[PDB]
Paper text:
The recently discovered CDGSH iron-sulfur domains (CISDs) are characterized by one or two highly conserved 17-residue CDGSH motifs with a consensus sequence of [ΦCXCXX(S/T)XXXPΦCDG(S/T/A)H], where Φ and X are a hydrophobic or any residue, respectively. The [2Fe-2S] cluster is coordinated with three cysteine residues and one histidine residue in the CDGSH motif. We synthesized genes for a type 3 CISD (PcCISD) from Pyrobaculum calidifontis, which is a hyperthermophilic archaeon, a type 4 CISD (RsCISD) from Ralstonia solanacearum, which is a soil-born plant pathogenic bacterium, and a type 6 CISD (MmCISD) from Magnetospirillum magneticum, which is an aquatic alphabacterium that utilizes iron reduction to derive energy. The four CISD structures display striking similarity in their overall appearance, with dual iron-sulfur binding modules and a β-sandwich dimerization module.
Author numbering:
A (entry chain A), B (entry chain B): 5 to 65
Write the structure that this text describes.
């Protein structure tokens, strides 16, 4: 599994992994890839929905 | 690999994985486990530094 934190962007996850809530609810992994919100403002958490551009999330690693 | 998105807090990643920048730089993973900032406010991105509590991050999944 490789996690790429995109600059000014989401975490890109690729490989064989599961996403779960603290409660234990399985969230959907499609095609062994996901983009998870890193900016805090997605309206579809934990998935990135483009909100990072709206709030000009500034994080360059 | 299991990614647990903690309520009002970081992503917990457990298992065999790497973390890389979009630039290609490997980031240091301690003992098959990391907490990655979900709130957008860590001053040590991509790692959670407890800033989620300071800015009262609200995401209960
Ligand atoms: S990183 Fe894309 S919506 Fe937050
Ligand atoms: S989730 Fe803990 S610092 Fe952002």
């Amino acid at each position: 599994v490789v996690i790429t934190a995109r600059n000014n962007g989401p975490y890109h996850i690729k490989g064989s992994f599961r996403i779960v809530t603290q409660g234990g609810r399985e969230l959907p992994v499609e095609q062994g890839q996901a983009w998870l919100c890193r900016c805090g403002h997605s309206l579809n958490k934990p998935f990135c929905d483009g909100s990072h551009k709206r709030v000009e999330f500034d994080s360059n690693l």
